[PDB]
Amino acid sequence: MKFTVEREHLLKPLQQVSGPLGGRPTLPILGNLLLQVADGTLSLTGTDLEMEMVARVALVQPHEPGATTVPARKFFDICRGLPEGAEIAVQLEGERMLVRSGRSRFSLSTLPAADFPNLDDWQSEVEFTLPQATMKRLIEATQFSMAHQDVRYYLNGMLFETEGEELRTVATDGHRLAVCSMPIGQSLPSHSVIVPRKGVIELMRMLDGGDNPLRVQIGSNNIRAHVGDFIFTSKLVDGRFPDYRRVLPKNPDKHLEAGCDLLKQAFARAAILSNEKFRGVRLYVSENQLKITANNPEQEEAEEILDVTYSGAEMEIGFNVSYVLDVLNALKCENVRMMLTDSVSSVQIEDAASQSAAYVVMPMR
């Protein structure tokens, strides 16, 4: 195995395959990157046995086919540490990989390519392509609502749902829900899958922002995403995600509109004096007014009064302020609409000007 590649063209691939390869690995080979030269292409693979990252680098300079595994972080650091425009000459020399550029020389320990975990091939059941910005939006709009190490393991991931020409992301922790729908301009079959937390993080991480579209392929127990010459593959969460459609309030009688920033700032201030563990705040809704109150065990109290657009019956609803703030911070719009039923039923929060994302927050007592 031998190849010579320009640093700037090895960097992003190494960053995309080695970036997710973190911490003390289970097997030592998991801390390694599989390098394979074949057909004028260098393939770089990083794995954790569940999720896989494969990058393909075109070799426009002389090369010799072969394969080996090298410590990922050390190899990335060497290439990154080399100067701008550096030509990186790589060669396998026994049980060690040689890296040469200018007057810089490195000999890395190898582990056999044959010992590298090869993930079984699988058949894609649903596939579609979409802009990176659309995937970013779908994830960012709902990611915060995913559960954190919940016993209901299926809640620690994000649901990816296809229906007609829409791709939808759903995330819930059983207390609050986030749902984002985006039109994808391709007729899709009705499919629903749960992507694990780490797969979600990686899907976000792989989005460079650029012109490259993202090609998603979903199988029965795996998901793969292609962006340029990078292939991210993740196992799916084998579980049944709750039905978001049921969770959505049927026909709310009460509708409140407020400036997102004024509302956010009032909640952020009341949050300071709320219970550190329970984060409970009280909302008192009245004609064109919202009063937010918070108190903690040390009997400290916060009160905020805001002008809102509310034409309905006066009501008092309790909420975990963190859940509300998470929604208000995820919204990034001028005005928000809160759709309420009663004090013991969930609120739906959305951008007053858009129904693409909806946030359902169950109240407290």
Partner: peptide, 5 residues
């Protein structure tokens, strides 16, 4: 804290 489901 009430639950959605």
């Amino acid at each position: 804290q009430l639950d959605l489901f």
